[PDB]
Each structure stands twice: as structure tokens, then as C-alpha cells.
Design a protein around this ligand. Structure first.
Ligand code: CLF
Ligand code: CLF
Ligand SMILES: [Ca+2]
Ligand SMILES: [Ca+2]
Lengths: 522, 405, 522, 405
């Protein structure tokens, strides 16, 4: 039933006694459900040491992974170039999901096409679809470039993207000079970040490979910036803002900030900003090239060093105090531009905030997960603040990456109790937060389920989640945040301190019970 | 036929999305395994809002994502020995599950693995129901084929599990709700009415579905079908092998709800038809107050649906009760079409609300899908009415043009 | 007792059984406490209609006010000028409190002196203290200007600030040309915002009054900006950033952004940035003057219009969409500079966010309080979003201001259930949130006590608090936020939506109870 | 004498801060009225952390701010009729209060109003204890005078309320903790020890204070004084009119706690001295583990306190137990002084941590004051030890200099 004056949605609607009884009948009479005592029994069992040991001995089963598939990364890279149309060679299903997955995180339209290869292409290859597909997409959406990648179906039957694309220019389905760079993005290899890697490299070669004799290291006097898989619009902005503040000329290779944040005024803009073709062709003439997220820009590294002859610096992602220092000092050394007074003041305001908040951050235990660079950067930062990383997890990580993180933990007295895990999923993580309880979790929306699980065990076992990473579906506009540089370090520090504080407030709100510690001033 | 050509944008799903996403995924006490690479399952993980009641990770597993997460090795050597191994891990880590289904992703069909045998052999071994589904994404040109494949799997491995069992105590009022995905709670919001009317819903599957309920469906006297497009298949079959009739029903708005409630009762004696009247009487004032409150603020507004012609062949439901003008897509662009027709909101068709939003046009359809709900039943009408008003009349749509041109 | 491995602070320390029993003894045997049943009885009574009616009939008693005293405002104004030292003529106690109140909100050092008038000055006036005080402060802190205000003690015995200050230059305690502007800041009149008003005006006269014949309206081709009592550093920055984006020359009269956010690098800087004396002397040569917060810049208005001859535009504080539109259009009309493409895009991104979040914001009932301009600006905004202001309260408000707000509520279909109250305190507000429950509260830290009160009544009656305003003591770094313009509208919208969302998450976290609505996507 | 001259910075408080802020404010079941303009009470509202147990706004009112909020009219015509009126409003809106005190703000003394008469007359009328306090802020040159004035008020209007009452059932172990503000819970953390030792703390006032407890103070055998500076006055007086002795006690660190516990027991028989030993035995390992954990990370660190000379006349307490070097301020600047001495943290004196922070020097003293606590008792030592380590060793202090000069 409903009172028009105060209407109720599913929550709390279905809590009305009439729904409760109707559901008690459904269950008791037809679901043949296990006794509630058995359910609690098994639940209690899934929070123990014995279950953890068993849980970690999995070899075939993955439960609640923390990574997407390669082509997802490709699309995001492609989307960062001027008027280009991410094109994916393979099943339509994948694209439906890629766009839907970005729409939810960015809450914006995502351009991306498929050449819908069906059952027939499963035996005669997908040559034809590539032909018609390139033609109709070039006509319908009138792009200036089409970056091609592949779904896992195309990778299994093994279609040659190079030939297919040439046979298309051959029979004249699309102009000859029309840019059609490609990359094989095997979904059963690596993860979405590798995808961005293969896609970016595939685009760099197409515009640079055959024309390297006219290039000179230093010609345009700029510095190439390669972002990597970035889902925080504030990061593209913050880095451009600091380089521009030092007077350093630059070329951000792949900049989706514009299409992923188009204004709302009645007009739908399919294309917006991005890296122009010219900037790409002229990329070799740069002083050097910096890779914001090295751990997943390796293939790109090899090509930038063995073809453009750039002494790519060994820099960690510019997150936190120290790594932003290094990134800044190395950019000053490569362009000759000194660090302006403003950036020195900004560094000081971050240090100011760190000292204003250190008494609440010190000794707080955190569990975290996400992508390789993001995770280590966040680990470095948590350590600078005196916090205790405890469970560091990176599903799409490797053994070299893990040693790098283990070292960073040894270089500090705050990494004693930490442990890095790779190739582990969120079900593994779920056990850890039960057996060795942290104070908070830092990760994406998928961690909300681990919080609900821990809370079911009891209020004192609940592990609150601080949303940082990708993707974030249950909160709006957090994708405009910034995690890089001093600006992003300040934003992360603020989120952490105020989370500690809100949680404290919550536990001390009970009247004449725990409120004796409900201080006005904190 | 649908000449949906390559190189064009469409939020059209695959056979996997239709099989794992709408037909099997909702079944709460089963563990569904995305067999193949890590992507498909992650993107679909808790994507649709098929509400259910349970203890996730212990006896219900809807919002979880179990996957075989295929590496290069598995593609080359086949994932058969892997399938057998993970099924054993599921059995020890999730003892309270009542069955496993295997949703095939694109690679499975191509590298020619045989999940059927693993199902039969492991199923016999563990005395469990393991359902292999050949819903590889490239099959067919839409989710539609997935639905058909997902239905046959239900038929061949679950539906007839108790064809030789008679310990079931039936009544003359046993009914089964098939094809309701309980989006935002639509099925619960419907099941309430049908039981206040004297009927006993023995089977409600997919949404808040139970494996057990699927097996009892054949023991009913009538089959109520919400979404025919995806469950008609299994509906026609249950009528031949069991002689159980079926009918459509729609509780979208008070008009359709009363209509369909009347029609359902008719298939039964007169006491149900009387109860059906006591039910309609009981909710009469409730929806009238709803029309009294919102009709004034929604009257004259034109909602465009994806139907042929300029107006529906009949009553859509709730839109009419609120005095809204429902238009069609003509008899055949589509982007400019809408700009020239300038509706007040798109009610359905050619998905992706974000494109329309940029064009200044609301996009909230027949089902919850994303945020509110339920939208069906009498309680659902009020919810639908409120949301319609907030979307249509929100001041954000009147700010697209800056006051300085 | 304590385990060194996991030490406990007051919370949860005092929850240990040993402390609980020790406290049960203290109470039962010596406090002669009222029976717990009586306490619950009275509490239940303070949440009813009868108590509200009685509560609103107060004439002599003020409980939990929402306003500070005049001199507090003066100091903040004074602090915004280059190398000047806020000086307060009166008791030392007040200054101890002024500095402490700003330290807590800004978490920064606050410069401010007193001339500590004791009992003797209570009968012979505070003439002498003014003499020695000005000399030692001019010597010890070597300022370039000393803005004087008065505590209530000095106002009661009635000391003449003008004479006192002249007799000081007379006997030669301080140079003759040394700037010593003043203002009477009666604590028993108005509130802290009026204080800022009297102080700013008193400084404008000192540098302008006698030298108006050399000025020409248009000479420097700039636009004077008067902020008003601003406690969000992001507001001074956002406005300077937009004017600079339109190419409009300006002079922000009173800019404490610099001293209230000094870098941390081992050096304590007492003075930093601020409005130079030159900018002040040249203020009359401006095209016009805009008052960011009119409702409390009236005295300043009179002087700017009857001495500088500026046709000060009638603009509301630039908060929300529309009022930022008007502020922007009027600034374009006064300087001739057009609105740049960037500002039009930013306006579009705000409208984008509004439409991305409207389904969660629509129909949410809010109670709010704070200063006059801030409140009406926030009311205007809540309305643009489709929200329902319900209890608008402004302790330091007036009848004219209330009509202005009542009109704004009539100009929208969302102000039907709203009611504006003036001269009412937070104890009054407490009743309102009980008898006519809103979904959330928007106000300062002092509202945390109303939340604890409502929660004691039951979880379903709890009214969560969204911290926006001044002061904010229980959260760190929120003073760097921005509430003005498109930037601040975006930040406010984000805080509101994610609060609705976090609260929803919290209510739907119960396993097999309410979690059926614990959606991943929202 | 203190030549604290005008025109200089100092976070020195007034008589009001000392009377309302430390002596009366903590009394939980009383309603304290800031009589005067709105400022003083707002700035002091829940400024100090005198922990207590109660139901705020119903039977406890510590964190609330009741004020007469003086307008121009009141200053000119006197706030006497207003005082009488608000006292009546308090009685109906807060029926469960056990008394009212009137803390005078600067204006009250100047415009010559007489709150004493209102107190006597309204007090007689409502049969309540109304305490007028002439703590106008301009009086004296510090909080000190406020303390003295606040103590006399306690003496003259509360302390002797039951001098002719004998229904009180005393024991030979009745003790009273006077002058403990229970900052962060210091008094509870102390009261626990004193009772595990056989004593019965009948009166603990100011912190978590009760009006009732104040009136029983004279019925005790010994008076334990934590803060002599603010409560010595009333201590000396209770010894003459009642012959009740008093002593100081300090539970800052294990050394002082054991010391003071021994000394307290000595004032009593031998069974208490034995219990005192069972208590010290019980906590021995607990503080040893604390010293075992932190002494290594705090050893050699120099904390500077505001004492004459280069080293304290004796043991400060906890700092020494943790192997820290306590220095003094010499025999007489102060800003440069610290730069040239470069301590590791300022332990006390010349308040306002924010100035020192800018100078790269920690500022966390003997009492909680701002965030943690308790810091007294055995349980308090661990808390103090942990905070010391986090502040001293936090990496933020080692980042003041940018790596590029
Ligand atoms: S069409 Fe359907 S969604 Fe596409 S894959 Fe095929 S079953 Fe699945 Fe999966 S992993 Fe990624 S998203 Fe694809 S490229 Fe392969
Ligand atoms: S010294 Fe002490 S704190 Fe100063 S006033 Fe006097 S009792 Fe009070 Fe109060 S209202 Fe404001 S803060 Fe003052 S100027 Fe008057
Ligand atoms: Ca958007
Ligand atoms: Ca600071």
C-alpha cells in the first residue's frame, strides 16, 4: 500500500509487514532454503583462518576479480585522439559492455563501434566485416582516424588485422591515406591496462615508424607525456597545469579529458579535443618522453627508446610528496625550466596539511587494491603519512612489480606488517579483512560488498570502504577528482582524514553511552 | 532479418548477455560460472537489478562473479580440465549452493571444448545439477538467441527434474510467474496482488528465482508470462509435455493491472473473481490519489516509444493513466527525427540515455533498470508517477541555454 | 588495563567492564541522578509539538546561538590587508577567543593583539593602554598598518577611538603618517558579519575620505571586489580566477587567502599577501564596485555610493547557476569584456552534473542555517536542483532579508513547504527537525549535536548533517572548499548527492534484511 | 607582577574563561548562563574536553550554550529583569536541571547590574540553587583571578548546603578528587586506581562533576587536589571550617603514579598500603611493555617545558619513564631561543601550537586538551606513549625542505 504524500521506493517499501509475510511464505513453502542456523554456521565459517587457507589454495577458480579485459583499455586510449573512432574487431556483445562500463563510471556518452562478427565469420574469418565495417563507420560517423582493436573471438580464429585493413584500402572501401592504426588486444592476456599499452604503441608506430630519418631529438623543444590508463579527469588537468606553470612546452599523447566531460547545452558532441595527428607525427622531435604509469607502459617504452632514441627517465607515477618531487625535478632538468615559486608553495601547503592531520592518520591500517602504478603510488603515499598498509593486492600484477613494492615497504618503518599479493581476487581479499582486520579499505565500488559482509559479522568487525580507483559506480562525480601531484595528494589526504573522522563520529554518537567522546573539535 | 550493419553504434547485447544476464543470472541459489576470459563476467557483474532475498556468498550468489578467467594456456590446451577443477573448488568454498550452470563465453565454442561431458560427469560425481549453456557471444545477432538457448538449457537439465515425483501437494490455484526479472522488485510487487486474490504462486523464476521453484513449474495449473520475448519458448513447451496453459499479464499502471487481474481470475472459478474485486476495491483510492497528485503536472506531455505508427495499437498502461500523450517512431535517422519532433522524454528503444541527455531529452522507460522501482502493480504506479514528474519537470532541462547566447 | 599491541584511547577504553562498573558506582551513590525512566520521559517530551510551542515562546533565553560577536568579523577583515595587524581595544579574553576560534576553523596561526584593559581602565578609560599598546605593537611586530576595533568593555565605558588614536600620534608614541584606521564593533549589536562591515568601511574611509577630488570613476579601469565575511579560501580564489579568465582588471579589497594558507617549510610567516595600501587609495578610480555579500555590506554600500560615486549593481551573492550568470553578465557589461568560451563550457559542465544527479536530489527536504547571504544563496541553489528547503534559519537575520528569501521561495514550485526564521537559535531548530523531519541538515559543526539528539530518538528519526558554512571544527581542510560560482556549485552538488548516496548505502547494508537494495550502480 | 604589556600577542584567557571555562562549566547537572553579549559563550561552547556521562539537553548540559544574548536595550536599561525572565524559561524548558549559575561577562559589572539579588530572590522562589559569579572578563590579568572568584562562589553558595545535614553515611576511606577537569578522561582514569586501592571517592568535581558531589566534599576525610593553581583556594578553606586535610597527587607516568599512590595510602592505615601494593603489582607488566615498546623510539629526544633553569627541580613524570631529556627555558625572545636550542617538541608554556608547527616543532603537552587521552594513570601512560611516538617520529617533520632548495 502507499500514501501519496510520502511515497516509498523498493526501500523501505518491501519492509512493510504485508511484503515481509508474503516473502516468508515464498521462502518457507517453495525455495527449499537451508535452515537459517545452517546459513549462519557456514557464514561464520567463511570468516575463519581455515577457510582462508582453503580459499588461497584455488588454482582454477576466480571469484570477484579486480580487472577488466584488454580491449577495454584500447578503447580508452583510442578515444583520446582527435576525431578518432575506437573500432573493435569482433563480437557486438563486447562493445555493448565496454560502452556501458564507461557510461557508468563517467556518466557520459562513449563512442565506440563493432563490426559484429557472427557465426559465419567464425569459419571464414572476419575479412568481410572489416571491409563493410570500416566503410560504414567512415561514412556514418565521419571520423579522421579509426583505431582498431580485437575482441577475443577474433583473436582465437586468428584474423590478420594488418592484411584485412590493407585489403580494405585495396578494394577501395576507404581512402588510402585514411589513418587506420591497429593493435591485437588479447582478452586472455594481461588486463585492461595492457590493452591501453598495445593500443597506444600501435598508434605511435603508425604515425612514426616509417619516417624516422627526418626526426631530431630536440627539434620541437617539447616533452612527450604518456598518461596511461587514467580514469580521473583531474589527472590529465593537473599535469598540464603544472607543466604550463613551469613554462615547459609539452604534448600530452592521448587526452580524453575533453570528450569525457562535454558541456550540456542541447547539443550532442561525439568528438571533442584530444591529441591531434600532427602532435603525434611530431612526437619524435621531442626532448624526451615521460611515462606517467611505467608498470603498464612497457611495450610503449621499448618503442620510444628503440625508435625515437629518447632516454626515457625512470620515474614512478607522480603521486604523493616525494614522487611528485622527483617528477618535477627531472622535468626541470630535461627542459632547463626551473621550479617556479608557486609549485614550491603548493608543495608546502601539502606538507602543511600532512602535519595538520597526522595525528589521525598515523598507525591506521589499510587494505587496498587497484592497478599497479596507482597502487604503489598510493602505498608510497600512505607510508609518507605514517599509515600502515597491511594487505596490498593487485590482481593484474607481476613478480617484478611485487619486488618493487616490497622494496618500497622495506625503505620505511611503516611497512613492517604489509604483504603484497598478485593474481589474487576480491574473495581472497575478503578473507584477509576478516582474519587480519584493517581499519579501512581503499579500492573501487566492488569493495562495497566486502563491507556489507564484514558488517554482517558485527559492527566491530565492519571494514569501511574509501572509494578511490576504477570503476566507481555508486557515487557521482568522483571521476573529476585528481590523484596525481600535490593537488591529488591533498585531495586523497582529505578523503582519508575525514573518513577516519566520520567513522569516529558515527561510533561516538550514542547518547549517554559513547557520546562522551563526541567532540566538537577534532 | 534486421540489417544491423557493422561499423555502427548500438548498445545491442550478445547471446551471453541474454543467457547469463537475464535468464540464468537471477537464479539466486545457483552459482553461475562465466567460462572464458575475465572480461564478460566483470562487465556484467551485478549489472541488472534482479532483486532477491538471501545471504550473498553463502546461499545466494547473484551479485558475485565466478569465472574460469582464461589465460593463453587454457585457450591453447582447452579449458576442460580447468572446468572440472574449479567445479570442485566451488563445492568446497560454497557448500550451500544448490547447483552450477556454465555460461560459455566466445572462446569456448571456437577452441572446441566440450562442457556437456564435464557437466554430466561432475554432476553425476557430486550429485549436483550442472547446466552447460552454449551461449557463446558471437552466436546469433542479439540477446534473443541467448534467451532461446538459455531456455532450452532450463528445459533439458532442470525443468523435468521431478517428472516422476508426486510428493508435491498441489492446489487448484497454483500459478507460476515466468519471465519476471524482478527489476527494482517488480515481481514481488506483482506477486502480492495475485495472492491477495486467492492464487498461490508456486513458481516465480529468474527474478528472485530458486532452482527448486523451476522444477515445480510443471506442477502448476496456469503459467503467467511477463516477458514473452525471452520466455515464450519454454512456455509453449510446458503446454505440450504437461498441458499447462499460459497467458501474458501486465501490471504497468492501474488500467492494465485491473485488466490483467480480471483476465487472470477468469481462468478460474468465481470466488477468485470476487476476491479479484475486493483487491481492486482496496487499491482504488490509492491510485486515484496518485492520479490526483501527478496528472495535473504530467498532462499534455508526449512520451515517445519505439513502436510503429504514430500511436500504440492499444493502451501502453501507466502513461495514459497520467494523461500523457504517447507517440510512435512513425513507419521507418532517428537522431534528427527526435530533434524535429521534440518529445518530452523517450520511453523506450535505441538505448543509451546519455546520448539523449546531451540532446536535452529525458530517458526513463517502463522498467526501473537503473535507480528506482518497482514500477508495476499498484504500489509501483505511485513510484512511477513520482519519478515521471521529477524527470519531466526538473529545472535542469530548462537551463541548457546560457543567458548570454 | 591495556595491551601494548593494540592500545585504546578514551573511546573505547572507558567501555571496558571495569570502567563501566566504576561509573555505575559513582552515579548510583553520589550523583543523586534522576531515574533513567524520568530522563527518557523528559527527553521524549522535548521532541513533541507541545515542547516546540513552548520553546518558540522564549524572549529572554537564547540556547545554542548560531552567531559570533562583531569584533570577530573585524579581525578577519583587517587580516586581509598587507602587513597589517588586527588590534582590538579592550579585554585580553576576547582576543584569546578570537584567535582560538579561527585557529580551529583554519588550523593556521592567526595574528591579533589586545591592549589588555583591566579594572583600572574601567574607570579612567582606556586612553593609556591605547598609547603603550600602539607603540609596543608597532615595535614588536613591525606592521605597516594597525586596524583597531573594540571589545564590548570599551564600548560600555565609551572610549573615543578617534581621539585616543590622535593623542597617540600627538605625544609621539607612533609616527604621524602610520595608518591607524578604526571602527566601533559593538558586540551587543548585529553579529560577526556586521563587524566585518564596520571594519572594512572604517578602512576605506581612512584611505579615501579626505582626497576624493583627485579621483575619477574609470581612471584605473578596474573593478573593485568586496568579498565580505568569507571563511572558504576557495571563494577568494575562484572569483579571482574567473575575472582573470574574462580579462577583467580587478582589485580584491581584503584578501586573507595568503596568510590563512601559508606554506610549511620551517619558517613562520606572520604576514602574507593581502590588499596593499596603494590598491586601497586607488579604489575610487575604479569603474564600479561589486559587493559579493550585500546583505551584510550595507554600511560599506552607503559609503561606496555617497563618496566614490559608484553605481554599485544590485547583485545577489554569486552562488548557484542563475546568480553566477547574473554576476558574470553584469561584470561583462561593466568592463566591456565578453564571457569567454571557457566560462560557457564550465557553466555547461555544471548543468551536466545537475542532470546527472537530479534523480537523487529531487524532493529531498533540507533544513539549513548560517549567514544571510550564504543561506539565501544556498536556498536559491537547492531550488534550482529541485530540492525542498523546509526550515531556513538565520539567527543574525532581519525582516527585509526574510522577505527577500520568502519571495525567492514564491518564484519556485519547490518552496511551498519552506519557512524562514530569524532571531531563532539551534535549540529552536532542534525542535523543528523533530516535529517536521527533513532528510538532511546543512550547517556548521554545531549541528552535530542535533544529529546525536535525533538519533537518540531512533535510527529512523536521525537527521544527518552535511557540513557547509562556518565554523567547521570536526573535519579537516574543508575550509579550502569553494562555495561560489560554477566551481563551488559543483562542489556543493557533489557533497549533497554523495551524502544522499552514502546514507542510502548505510540503510541498505543489512544482510538478508535490507541489502536487496544495496545496488552496485547508483 | 608579570609585566604582560598591551599590543603583544598572548593566548592568555580572562576571568570568564577561568570561571566558566574550567571551574563551573564542567559541572554537568547545572545550567550555566553566560550573562552578557553572545560572543563569550559561543567561543567557549564545548571548547575544553571535560568528559562526562549524561543525556545532554535533558539532565547534563556541558556542551550547550545558554546565554542572555545582550542587545543594546539590555546594556542601557540593565539586564536584571531579563535575568529573572530567562531563569523562568530555563525552569520550564529544562525541568531536570539541578541548579543554575550565572557567569558574568564584561558588560555586567560595568553597567552596574546586581545579579546577586536576582539569584537570592529567584532561588528562594523556585527553591533552586542559583549561583551568581562576578567573573567579568576585565577583572585581574588572567584566568587565575577567575579561578579564585569561581571558588568563592562555590564556597558561599554551594559548599555549605548541608552543614546541618547528617543523614550522610560516611566511611573511614571517603576521599574527594578536587580540581580534576577530566580532560580526555584523566579523572576516571585516576579514580579507577584510587578505588582498586580500597578508597571510596565520594566527590569528584568539576570534571564529570555533580552539584550533589560538591555538597558532600566536606563530608570526606581527605582531599586530593590535582590542579592546585585553580582549586587550592577552596582547599585551604575546607581545612579550617571542617578540618579536612588536603594533598596534591600526580598520575603522569608510572613513576609519579606509584609515588603518589604510595603517599596517598600512607595517610591511611596499613590495609590500604597493602592494597596499594596489589594495585602496583597488577599494573607493573602493563607499563613495562609500554616502556619496552616506545623507550627505544623516544630515547634521547629533548622535550622543552616552561620551567626555570635547564632542568626540572625533580621528576616531571612520563617523559622520564620514556627515556626523554627534559630541558627548561633557562633563567629568563623565546621564538629565536627555540630555534637556537632546536628541541624535539615543546611540552608546555606560551601556547598556540600553530606558531610552533610553522617552525617545524611539535607541541603536545601534559594533558589531552585536543585529541587523545587520557594521559594519566597507568592506562593513560600507554596512550601518552603512543602519541609521543607518533608526533615525534612522524615523517611530516622531515619534509619541510624541498629537494631543490
Ligand atoms: S561477445 Fe559476449 S561480451 Fe564479448 S567476449 Fe563474447 S560472450 Fe563476452 Fe568478453 S572477454 Fe572481453 S568482453 Fe569480449 S573481448 Fe572477450
Ligand atoms: S573578555 Fe572574557 S571573552 Fe571578552 S567579552 Fe569579556 S568576559 Fe567575554 Fe565576549 S562578547 Fe565578544 S568575546 Fe569579548 S567582545 Fe564582548
Ligand atoms: Ca555527464
Ligand atoms: Ca595549517
Amino acid at each position: 500500500s502507499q500514501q501519496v504524500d510520502k511515497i516509498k521506493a523498493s526501500y523501505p517499501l518491501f519492509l512493510d509487514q504485508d511484503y515481509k509475510d508474503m516473502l516468508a511464505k515464498k521462502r518457507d513453502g517453495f525455495e527449499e532454503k537451508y535452515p537459517q542456523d545452517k546459513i549462519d554456521e557456514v557464514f561464520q565459517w567463511t570468516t575463519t583462518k581455515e577457510y582462508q587457507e582453503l580459499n588461497f589454495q584455488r588454482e582454477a577458480l576466480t571469484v570477484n576479480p579486480a580487472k577488466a579485459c584488454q580491449p577495454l583499455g584500447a578503447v580508452l586510449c583510442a578515444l583520446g585522439f582527435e576525431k578518432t573512432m575506437p573500432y573493435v574487431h569482433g563480437s557486438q556483445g563486447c562493445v555493448a559492455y565496454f560502452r556501458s562500463y564507461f557510461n557508468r563510471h563517467f556518466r557520459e556518452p562513449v563512442s565506440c563501434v563493432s563490426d559484429s562478427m557472427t557465426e559465419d565469420a567464425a569459419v571464414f574469418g572476419g575479412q568481410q566485416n572489416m571491409k563493410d565495417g570500416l566503410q560504414n563507420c567512415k561514412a556514418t560517423y565521419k571520423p579522421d582516424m579509426i583505431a582498431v582493436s580485437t575482441t577475443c573471438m577474433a583473436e582465437v580464429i586468428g584474423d590478420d588485422l594488418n592484411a584485412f585493413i590493407n585489403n580494405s584500402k585495396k578494394e577501395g572501401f576507404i581512402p588510402d591515406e585514411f589513418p587506420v592504426p591497429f593493435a591485437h588486444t588479447p582478452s586472455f592476456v594481461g588486463s585492461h591496462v595492457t590493452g591501453w599499452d598495445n593500443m597506444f604503441e600501435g598508434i605511435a608506430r603508425y604515425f612514426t615508424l616509417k619516417s624516422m630519418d627526418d626526426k631530431v631529438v630536440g627539434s620541437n623543444k617539447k616533452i612527450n607525456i604518456v598518461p596511461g590508463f587514467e580514469t580521473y579527469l583531474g589527472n590529465f588537468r593537473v599535469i598540464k597545469r603544472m607543466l604550463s606553470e613551469m613554462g615547459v612546452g609539452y604534448s600530452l599523447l592521448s587526452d580524453p579529458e575533453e570528450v569525457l566531460d562535454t558541456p550540456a547545452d542541447g547539443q550532442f558532441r561525439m568528438y571533442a579535443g584530444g591529441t591531434t595527428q600532427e602532435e603525434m607525427k611530431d612526437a619524435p622531435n621531442a626532448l624526451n618522453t615521460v611515462l606517467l604509469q611505467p608498470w603498464h607502459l612497457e611495450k610503449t617504452k621499448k618503442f620510444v627508446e628503440g625508435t625515437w632514441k629518447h632516454e626515457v627517465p625512470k620515474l614512478n607515477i607522480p603521486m604523493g610528496l616525494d614522487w611528485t618531487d622527483e617528477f618535477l625535478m627531472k622535468v626541470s632538468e630535461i627542459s632547463g625550466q626551473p621550479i617556479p615559486a608557486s609549485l614550491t608553495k603548493e608543495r608546502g601547503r601539502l606538507v602543511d596539511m600532512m602535519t595538520d592531520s597526522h595525528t589521525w592518520l598515523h598507525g591506521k591500517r589499510f587494505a587496498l587494491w587497484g592497478d599497479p602504478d596507482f597502487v604503489m603510488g598510493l602505498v608510497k603515499f600512505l607510508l609518507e603519512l605514517g599509515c600502515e598498509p597491511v594487505h596490498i593486492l593487485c590482481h593484474n600484477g607481476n613478480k617484478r612489480w611485487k619486488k618493487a613494492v616490497d622494496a618500497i615497504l622495506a625503505a620505511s618503518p611503516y611497512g613492517k606488517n604489509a604483504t603484497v599479493y598478485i593474481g589474487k581476487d576480491l574473495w581472497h581479499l575478503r578473507s584477509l579483512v576478516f582474519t587480519d582486520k584493517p581499519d579501512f579499505m581503499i579500492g573501487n565500488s566492488y569493495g562495497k560488498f566486502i563491507q556489507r559482509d564484514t558488517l554482517h559479522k558485527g559492527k566491530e568487525f565492519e571494514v569501511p570502504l574509501i572509494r578511490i580507483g576504477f570503476p566507481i559506480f555508486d557515487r557521482h562525480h568522483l571521476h573529476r577528482s585528481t590523484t596525481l601531484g600535490y593537488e591529488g595528494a591533498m585531495q586523497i589526504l582529505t578523503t582519508l582524514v575525514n573518513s577516519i573522522l566520520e567513522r569516529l563520529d558515527e561510533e561516538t554518537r550514542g547518547m549517554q553511552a559513547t557520546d562522551y567522546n563526541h567532540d566538537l573539535v577534532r | 532479418n534486421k540489417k544491423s550493419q557493422p561499423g555502427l553504434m548500438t548498445i545491442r547485447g550478445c547471446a551471453y548477455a541474454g543467457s547469463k544476464g537475464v535468464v540464468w543470472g537471477p537464479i539466486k541459489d545457483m552459482i553461475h560460472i562465466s567460462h572464458g576470459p575475465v572480461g564478460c563476467g566483470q562487465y556484467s557483474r551485478a549489472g541488472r537489478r534482479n532483486y532477491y532475498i538471501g545471504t550473498t556468498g553463502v546461499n545466494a550468489f547473484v551479485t558475485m562473479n565466478f569465472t574460469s578467467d582464461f589465460q593463453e594456456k587454457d585457450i591453447v590446451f582447452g579449458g576442460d580440465k580447468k572446468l572440472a577443477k574449479l567445479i570442485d573448488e566451488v563445492e568446497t568454498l560454497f557448500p550451500l549452493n544448490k547447483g552450477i550452470s556454465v555460461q560459455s563465453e566466445c572462446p569456448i565454442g571456437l577452441i572446441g571444448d566440450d562442457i556437456e561431458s564435464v557437466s554430466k560427469v561432475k554432476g553425476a560425481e557430486l550429485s549436483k545439477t550442472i547446466v552447460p549453456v552454449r551461449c557463446e557471444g558471437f552466436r546469433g545477432v542479439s540477446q534473443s538467441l541467448g534467451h532461446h538457448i538459455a531456455n532450452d538449457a532450463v528445459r533439458d537439465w532442470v525443468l523435468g527434474k521431478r517428472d516422476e515425483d508426486t510428493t508435491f501437494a498441489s492446489t487448484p490455484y497454483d500459478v507460476a510467474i515466468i519471465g519476471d526479472y524482478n527489476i527494482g522488485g517488480d515481481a514481488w510487487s506483482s506477486r502480492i496482488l495475485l495472492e491477495e486474490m486467492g492464487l498461490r504462486c508456486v513458481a516465480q523464476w529468474s527474478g528472485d528465482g530458486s532452482i527448486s521453484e523451476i522444477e515445480l513449474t510443471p506442477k502448476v495449473k496456469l503459467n503467467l508470462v511477463h516477458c514473452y520475448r525471452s520466455m515464450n519458448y519454454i512456455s509453449r513447451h510446458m503446454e505440450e509435455k504437461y498441458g499447462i496453459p499460459w497467458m501474458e499479464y501486465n501490471f504497468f499502471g492501474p488500467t492494465k493491472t485491473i485488466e490483467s487481474l480480471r483476465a487472470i481470475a477468469a481462468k478460474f472459478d468465481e470466488s477468485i473473481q470476487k476476491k479479484c474485486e475486493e483487491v481492486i476495491a482496496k487499491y482504488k483510492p490509492e491510485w486515484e490519489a496518485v492520479v490526483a497528485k501527478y496528472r495535473p503536472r504530467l498532462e499534455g506531455k508526449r512520451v515517445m516509444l519505439y513502436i510503429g505508427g504514430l500511436r500504440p495499437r492499444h493502451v501502453i498502461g501507466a502513461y495514459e493513466d497520467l494523461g500523457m500523450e504517447v507517440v510512435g517512431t512513425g513507419y521507418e535517422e532517428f537522431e534528427e527525427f527526435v530533434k524535429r519532433i521534440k518529445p518530452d522524454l523517450i520511453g523506450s528503444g535505441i538505448k543509451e540515455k546519455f546520448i539523449f541527455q546531451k540532446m536535452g531529452i529525458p530517458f526513463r522507460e517502463m522498467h526501473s533498470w537503473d535507480y528506482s522501482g518497482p514500477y508495476h502493480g499498484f504500489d509501483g504506479f505511485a513510484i512511477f508517477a513520482r519519478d515521471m514528474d521529477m524527470t519531466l519537470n526538473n529545472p535542469c532541462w530548462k537551463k541548457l541555454q546560457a543567458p548570454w547566447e
